[PDB]
Write a protein that binds this ligand. Structure first.
Ligand code: MET
Ligand code: SF4
Ligand code: SF4
Length: 288
């Protein structure tokens, strides 16, 4: 039994979404945060997450419930237009575009991701766009394609501390490669906001978490999120422990002192959790 800290705007977003051919990770993961992200924050912003390039990943990360197969179906060439259209009609404030990894594609899908960003920004430049990208196996030209697509925030996850990369992630991912992605995004587009996420509860200790946060700062990562690893099914990695609410508040203070522009830290925090609210409050510093 999970610890208890892991248990108008929303209905307006839900009713509008019912008519549009758009499908989210928010509902198709049964995310416990949909009440918060979908309009229930301080600024009442709407954030949601859409996953491009199919529902089958070429990788098999043991923390992740996305289905895996060696030869996923080909890309839906209509998805960039259909997605960007459906987002603009849904009326979102901040959208997180993410995707499965497509190691079967030479550019890992970067052109597909970039086309979606570009379509959306032309329809409505008022929408903030974050892309949570694959590592593209370190392909600098693929990273460059997305970084130049006009997005506001370039995100890519390290997921865990360097010592646990081989346990937690598919062998095609690693810590230095992920840092190279974030560094190259900033090199190609210096005014982009860079962002990464770490899960706690997988066996890391405090010394490794601090060292990781320090290294992320040296790589000029602007924003950080920390949340609890929650085991999707009994076949996935076992939870080593549930981090306390007060310990997550400790890490937020540590991230502030290290100079992250925001450190979103809490048991239910995910990469996309209230991403629009964190952007508005800490980067835009909007007065309500
Ligand atoms: C949907 S998981 C995040 C995006 C990408 N599949 C990655 O692991 O890097
Ligand atoms: S945390 Fe991510 S998937 Fe969950 S409701 Fe918020 S944006 Fe959607
Ligand atoms: S690459 Fe991303 S989508 Fe694929 S298994 Fe790993 S975390 Fe899940």
């Amino acid at each position: 039994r999970l610890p208890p800290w892991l248990k108008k705007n929303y209905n307006k977003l839900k009713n509008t979404l019912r008519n549009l051919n758009l499908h989210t990770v928010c509902e198709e993961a049964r995310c416990p945060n949909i009440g918060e992200c979908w309009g229930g924050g301080e600024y009442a912003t709407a954030t949601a997450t859409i996953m491009l390039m199919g529902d089958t990943c070429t990788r098999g990360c043991r923390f992740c419930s996305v289905k895996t197969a060696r030869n996923p179906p080909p890309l839906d060439a209509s998805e960039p237009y259909n997605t960007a259209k459906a987002i603009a009609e849904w009326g979102l404030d901040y959208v997180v575009l993410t995707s499965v990894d497509r190691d079967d594609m030479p550019d890992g899908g970067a052109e597909h991701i970039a086309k979606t960003v570009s379509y959306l920004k032309e329809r409505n430049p008022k929408i903030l766009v974050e892309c949570l990208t694959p590592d593209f196996r370190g392909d600098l030209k693929a990273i460059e394609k997305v970084a130049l697509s006009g997005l506001d925030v370039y995100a890519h996850n390290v997921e865990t501390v360097p010592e646990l990369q081989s346990k937690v992630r598919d062998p095609r991912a690693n810590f230095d490669q992920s840092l190279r992605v974030l560094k190259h995004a900033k090199k190609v587009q210096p005014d982009v906001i860079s962002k990464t996420s770490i899960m706690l509860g997988l066996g890391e200790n405090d010394e490794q978490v601090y060292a990781t946060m320090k290294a992320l700062r040296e790589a000029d990562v602007d924003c950080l999120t920390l949340g609890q690893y929650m085991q999707p099914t009994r076949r996935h990695l076992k939870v080593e422990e549930y981090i306390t609410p007060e310990k997550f508040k400790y890490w937020e203070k540590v991230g502030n002192e290290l100079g992250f522009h925001y450190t979103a830290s809490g048991p239910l925090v995910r990469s996309s959790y209230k991403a629009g609210e964190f952007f508005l409050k800490n980067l835009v510093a909007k007065r309500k």
